[PDB]
Symmetry: none
Subunit: 252 residues, 2 copies
């Protein structure tokens, strides 16, 4: 089974938040240059996650996408406060391959279907932020701060039913940690959906990616661990290929 | 708290009295099919009101409660022939989430407390039918025909004391009409109770719902205006959300898909 390695860039005001340690780049915190550089060294897909809280949010995300679409030739996902079909449509028409939704999907699951009905399920990504609460995995919205009371197991099933193309499974229990992906969470979700599962949060070293794929993840997404160069993308892919993981190195 | 939209279905011998205008249904007068359909287009809670007379048929209604409970994944309230704890108790054990009482409560207020102690206050709904009489809000029993002489103010307060979970506030002054909920009555009752208030009678158009919620209603119940499709449920929820009301959209579009059947 083919496995995907994704890099995610957190953005604010058109800049990579907390930047990156790639001194070779003209601008360590330029999302476009960093994204191009990742696409050239072996990343399979890019996520651009906006946390801009300004009145300029829509215009900027749209500006960024159009620029990114020029320079970058691997799949692009945009996410972060995308709340309705018209916003999602604008971003896709401007060049995003996939749009990622979360809080708006949870509150209005019809939105998944609206996007999928026009652009295809493959254009739709649902980010599910989950956390253990009193012995059960629960869904959290608004940047991980609202306990919805919705069970992870129920929401995964509804997400597929509504027409989502893939699920990013972010463990709030691994937020900021470097101990490993939440493989218990990934194993919990795996039998519940036929969609691709993208693991997010907890990655600290190359072996963690192997564990995530053994747990049934189809893809593994990371951010700071890459930007900080704690893990080198090419080294990661060589490692995974060495131990029998079907990763794409057939690049050039 | 999200403002709530309830649909009430009036039943006679297992049939929806006067049916519905949803021709997509195989049987627009089947309460199970209609109830399930409402739950999959945006209704938040359902009430089933049985007006079947015979003792012989209060077993048939029980079997119906089981089947709607199993089939429908939103809260179910049942009312109609409840006159004691036993009948109330059985409906809940059959799968009703809540029981709704009116005349039975007024003619025995301890019945409220009885149900509550066994099943929690949340399973107890008191329907209050009221009407202006000489510039006073008075309580009516027996389908709004009998003036009990009890002030709405006093009855609202007793009903909460006895341990009801919520109050449905039905305006007899508004029955048959489509000129709106009795927002004056709703405003009258709001400061008197901490319980959820469900508005009933008078709704004719979507804006009437907005008015009720501005009046302090926690929920709005309607029947004929939904069954006739004078008001579309999804359109109602979208209108309320548009003008800033906190309503639940999770149930919207549950029947729709991302493919294209021609």
């Amino acid at each position: 089974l083919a496995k995907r390695i994704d890099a995610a860039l957190i953005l604010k005001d058109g800049r990579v938040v907390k930047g990156s340690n790639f001194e070779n780049l003209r601008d360590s915190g330029d999302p476009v240059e960093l994204g191009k550089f990742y696409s050239e060294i072996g990343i399979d897909e890019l996520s651009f996650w906006d946390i801009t809280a300004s009145v300029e949010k829509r215009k900027t995300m749209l500006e960024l996408v159009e620029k990114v679409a020029e320079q970058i030739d691997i799949p692009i996902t945009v996410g972060g406060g995308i709340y309705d079909f018209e916003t999602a449509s604008e971003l896709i028409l401007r060049g995003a391959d996939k749009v990622e939704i979360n809080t708006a999907a949870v509150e209005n699951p019809s939105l998944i279907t609206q996007i999928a009905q026009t652009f295809g399920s493959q254009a739709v990504v649902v980010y599910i932020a989950a956390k253990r609460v009193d012995g059960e995995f629960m869904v959290f919205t608004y940047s991980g701060t609202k306990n919805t009371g919705i069970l992870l197991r129920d929401w995964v099933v509804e997400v597929e039913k509504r027409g989502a193309g893939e699920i990013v499974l972010g463990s709030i229990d691994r937020l900021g940690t470097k101990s490993g992906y939440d493989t218990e969470m990934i194993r919990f979700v795996r039998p519940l959906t036929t969609l691709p599962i993208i693991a997010h949060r907890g990655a600290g070293k190359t072996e963690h990616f192997l564990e995530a794929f053994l747990a049934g993840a189809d893809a593994a997404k990371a951010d700071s661990v890459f930007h900080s160069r704690e893990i080198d993308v090419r080294e990661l892919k060589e490692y995974l290929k060495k131990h029998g993981v079907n990763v794409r190195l057939e690049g050039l």
